[PDB]
Write a protein that binds this ligand. Structure first.
Ligand code: HEM
Ligand code: 7VS
Length: 289
């Protein structure tokens, strides 16, 4: 099973920068969503969940086919709440109907990370919409109630190593949990991309509690929370070393996150040797917009 990148006909960097800009302008405009968090974090989670269905063993799933647009995937319990990000993107797609679904969903995550002052994430075009019968079954995205061994094994299926896993999880500085979506109730909401996930893990006084959905989570007196899978990064000695590294080196975290997140979004895709180089989009701020 091979998925070859195919550039949308006649398109180049400037076309995609226009889509980036439309997403970024709408992020700025629709600021009230989710108690003024805005749509940045849910777009990051959307890009990760359309990519995190990938299976390295048979190349099923992943971002290429844009299959989150189909009912089976759209209605995955693991994806509860991402419909908000889909609705955000719908007018963007209407404005730029030439772009594929997979390219739009992944570009949404890149735009959100950069506009929230995160690292630049190089991004490649060419994902191609595939038919409904290529939609992966539910159950490929990870459980939150598990431990470090579960996290490590889970991410092997996405071809991610310990360093990549710990860097990707730093996205849990963003947004919040919602009891109605996932059975975890949130605290510590944020919409600026920093390494504070790692600082909070190491510096907060955590207490294991049972929430109103009967699930366990780690709560701090400051109002932050950690999933059991988050907290497992300081229970496992190999993860703990990397958590300490990122807590003490913002630039290293940004660089490692950028690589891992681009990789995540490109897993499963074969890029022709003549394909364009990855694009690095300017932020609105860099453009004076
Ligand atoms: C073991 C791996 C992971 C688990 C178990 C997990 C689990 C969860 C859960 C339960 C939520 C709360 C959803 C809600 O209630 O709305 C959440 C939110 C979120 N996750 Fe993860 N996640 C994992 C990895 C990742 C990765 C790899 C990324 C991206 C690089 C990511 C990005 C996000 C973001 C940005 C949010 C906030 C969404 C919002 O505010 O609407 N997560 N995650
Ligand atoms: N303090 N806990 C979080 C804050 C923002 N986003 C998250 C996403 C997943 C798990 C925990 C958090």
């Amino acid at each position: 099973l091979v998925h070859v990148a195919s550039v949308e006909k006649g398109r180049s960097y400037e076309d995609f920068q226009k889509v980036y800009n439309a997403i970024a302008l709408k992020l700025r405009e629709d600021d009230e969503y989710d108690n003024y968090i805005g749509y940045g974090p849910v777009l990051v989670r959307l890009a990760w969940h359309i990519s995190g269905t990938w299976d390295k063993h048979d190349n099923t799933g992943g971002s290429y086919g844009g299959t989150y647009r189909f009912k089976k995937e759209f209605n995955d319990p693991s994806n509860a709440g991402l419909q908000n990000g889909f609705k955000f993107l719908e007018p963007i797609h209407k404005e730029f109907p030439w772009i594929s679904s997979g390219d739009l969903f992944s570009l949404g995550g890149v735009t959100a990370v950069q506009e929230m002052q995160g690292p630049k994430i190089p991004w490649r075009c060419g994902r191609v919409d595939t038919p409904e019968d290529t939609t992966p079954d539910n159950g490929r995205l990870p459980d939150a109630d598990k431990d470090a061994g579960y996290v490590r094994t889970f991410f092997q299926r996405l071809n991610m190593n310990d360093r990549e896993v710990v860097a990707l999880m730093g996205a849990h500085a963003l947004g919040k949990t919602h009891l109605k979506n996932s059975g975890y109730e949130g605290g510590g909401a944020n919409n600026v991309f920093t390494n504070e996930f790692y600082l909070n893990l190491l510096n907060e006084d955590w207490k294991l509690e049972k929430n109103d959905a009967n699930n366990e989570q780690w709560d701090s007196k400051s109002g932050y929370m950690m999933l059991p899978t988050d907290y497992s990064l300081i229970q496992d000695p190999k993860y703990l070393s990397i958590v300490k590294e990122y807590a003490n080196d913002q630039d290293k975290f940004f660089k490692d996150f950028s690589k891992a997140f681009e990789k995540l979004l490109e897993n499963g895709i074969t890029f022709p040797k003549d394909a364009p180089s990855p694009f690095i989009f300017k932020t609105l701020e860099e453009q004076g917009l």
